[PDB]
């Protein structure tokens, strides 16, 4: 798809047997989703930095699908105001910004 | 240009007689730059919301240029960790996400 930036790029995502809604965010380095029950071992990671840190759960090589296209990447699970698909996963979807 | 999301999409921008460096951020609704001396009347605006608000200066119909292409949009000036080109300005550059 070609996504226009008139609206927030909120897309439907398939991750871990759930269908959630998440934002395509080029400003974000990493991918953070609200609580979800993913497979595997997870490591504890600090994200944030600005205003304080937020402890999340880093899971590796997790598959999410977006608008038909599948991606394998690191996904961090913790309390997040909105679900972020950041660049680790944007690059996996073959995603570019274009103008 | 077609921008890849392996690195942070940090680009050079021409705004208000300055050349600054700013992030192409689809996750951001608005455009916020660090202190700069822009023309015009500005209105005071609250942004943030999460963790607290940050008082910025909303200037209208400001021209920024990025990688050859010119845009006219609202730009808010205040203390920001990194300069954000959010969607108000991304849409002006004819910018899409693509995969």
Rounded to whole angstroms, what are the CA distances from A26 to A1, A21, A67, A84, B43?
Answer: 16, 16, 17, 9, 28
Q: Which two tokens stand for residue B97?
A: 């996400």
Q: Which two tokens stand for residue B78?
A: 């205040």
The string of DSSP letters for chain A reads -EEESSS--EEEEEETTEEEEEEE-TT-SS-EESS---SS-EEEEEEE-SSSEEEEEEEEEEEEEETTEEEEEEEEES--SSEEE-HHHHTTTT-EEE-
Hey, are the CB atoms on A25 and B26 less than 8 Å from each other? yes
> Edge-to-edge strands of the sheet including A2-4?
A2-4, B96-98, A96-98, B2-4
Query: How does strand B53-66 pair with strand B69-77?
Result: antiparallel
User: A99 CB near a chain B CB, below 8 Å?
Assistant: yes
End-to-end CA distance of chain A: 15
Q: How far apart are CA B84 and CA A8, in angstroms?
A: 15
Residue of A nearest to B27 (CA): A25
Q: Please name each of the domains of chain B with its CATH number.
A: 1-99 (2.40.70.10)
Element (H, E) at B3: strand B2-4
Query: Chain A closest CA to B70's CA: distance in Å?
Result: 11
Element (H, E) at B94: none
In this structure, what DSSP letter does residue B91 have? T
Query: Chain A closest CA to B67's CA: distance in Å?
Result: 9
A32 near A89, Cβ under 8 Å?
A: no
> Determined by which method?
X-ray
**Residue recorded with tokens 């400003």:** A27
Provide the Cα torsion B29, B32, B38, B40; round to 10°.
40
List the one residue out of A82, A57, A59 whose CA is nearest residue A72.
A59
């Amino acid at each position: 798809p070609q996504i226009t930036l008139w609206k927030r790029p909120l897309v439907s995502i398939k991750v871990g047997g759930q269908i959630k809604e998440a934002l395509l965010d080029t400003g974000a380095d990493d991918t953070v989703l609200e609580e979800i029950n993913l497979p595997g071992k997870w490591k504890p990671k600090m994200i944030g930095g600005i205003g304080g840190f937020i402890k999340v759960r880093q899971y590796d090589q997790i598959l999410i699908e977006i608008c038909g296209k599948k991606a394998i990447g690191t996904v961090l699970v913790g309390p997040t105001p909105v679900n972020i698909i950041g660049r680790n996963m944007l690059t996996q979807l073959g995603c570019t910004l274009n103008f």
